[PDB]
Structure 1
Amino acid sequence: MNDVFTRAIAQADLKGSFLLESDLDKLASFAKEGVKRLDAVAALTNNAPAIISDAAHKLFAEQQELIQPGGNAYPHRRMAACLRDMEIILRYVSYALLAGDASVLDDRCLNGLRETYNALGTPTQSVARAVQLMKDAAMVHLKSTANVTVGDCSSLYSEAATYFDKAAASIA
């Protein structure tokens, strides 16, 4: 697990010299925008139940075979497992968003997750769909301009989109 700064440092170390002025400008700009980044991570953290309820409702509307006898979210145990997985993946996406890098998400969360779901008999495409729906709800909450100073945050929205899309692509 490394952030944007440790990523830059590792790339510099591989070639084996100091961080260039362009690299330091990039990282200083990142730290300057880190306040907006904190706002985005707070948006994901305070609205997790809303995001995951919305995603689950949409997912079991589109895919009814999941919540009906025989389905992979049928009894309370597997339904709870599904909502738990949604919580987990949202959590790691917010971690990566704070880090400014997707190393925590990939290394700690999504690495053996497709293998786990394949061994359990869980539709990885349904899981990816759930992550997409959860991305959409999360993006609704991130853009919220209430309680927070107004300003451009398009880079943050795009970055959160890449984190969710990477999660989906890794699962499916």
Structure 2
Amino acid sequence: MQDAITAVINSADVQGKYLDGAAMDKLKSYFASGELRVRAASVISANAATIVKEAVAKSLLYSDVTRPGGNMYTTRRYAACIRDLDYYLRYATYAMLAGDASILDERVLNGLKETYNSLGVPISSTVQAIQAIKEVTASLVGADAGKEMGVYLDYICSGLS
């Protein structure tokens, strides 16, 4: 996977040059964002379970998916959704802390479409739950950290779409 710093490193090294002024500027910009990234990551780790709980409450509960026959039926499957939302949130936090959403399409989106197609998961329902998580985390962490987290979560949603 690639972060904001190794992204600049590989961008320079593909042409093989050294680190010029633009590379140093990009690294300094990432270092400036690092404070916000670290604070948001710590808060999200602290409130991970509550965030997914609230998103599930406001996006999935009391609907056809949770009703009998629905994909959220069969409590093993409900726990599977809880774990999946936890995975999405944790890897979104990883991507936000890295500054590049390469881990999202490497360790997360890789095979996700075919997985959900085989398992009959409601893709739009999962996407909607992801925006619910995005809104909850944005409210919890603020405007800028919420901005970055929403960027990466919506990248995940676009990958699902």
TM-score (normalizing by structure 2): 0.94
Distance in 2 (alpha carbons) for counterparts of 1:134 and 1:4: 24
Q: Which residue of 1 aligns with 2:64?
A: 65
Deviations 1:100-144 (A, max 9, x none): 11111210011211110001111111111110101110111111x
- What is the SS of the residue equivalent to 2:67? coil
- Determine if contact 2:60/2:129 at 8 Å carries over to the other structure: no
Distance in 1 (alpha carbons) for counterparts of 2:83 and 2:154: 19
Distance in 2 (alpha carbons) for counterparts of 1:106 and 1:46: 25
* 1:33 correspondence with 2:33: yes
- What is the SS of the residue equivalent to 1:111? coil
The verdict on how the C-alpha distance between 1:16 and 1:136 changes in structure 2, with shifts beyond 3 A counting, is same
Listed as ranges, the gaps of 5+ residues in structure 2 are none
Deviations 1:1-38 (A, max 9, x none): 12111111111111221122022012123113312210
Identity of aligned residues (%): 40
Superposition deviation, residue 60 in structure 1: 2.3
Deviations 1:137-166 (A, max 9, x none): 0111111xxxxxxxxx63x43221110101
Distance in 2 (alpha carbons) for counterparts of 1:7 and 1:164: 19
Q: Which residue of 2 aligns with 1:51?
A: 51
TM-score (normalizing by structure 1): 0.88
- Determine if contact 2:60/2:125 at 8 Å carries over to the other structure: no
Superposition deviation, residue 84 in structure 1: 0.7
How many matched pairs? Answer: 161
Q: Which amino acid aligns with 1:13?
A: D
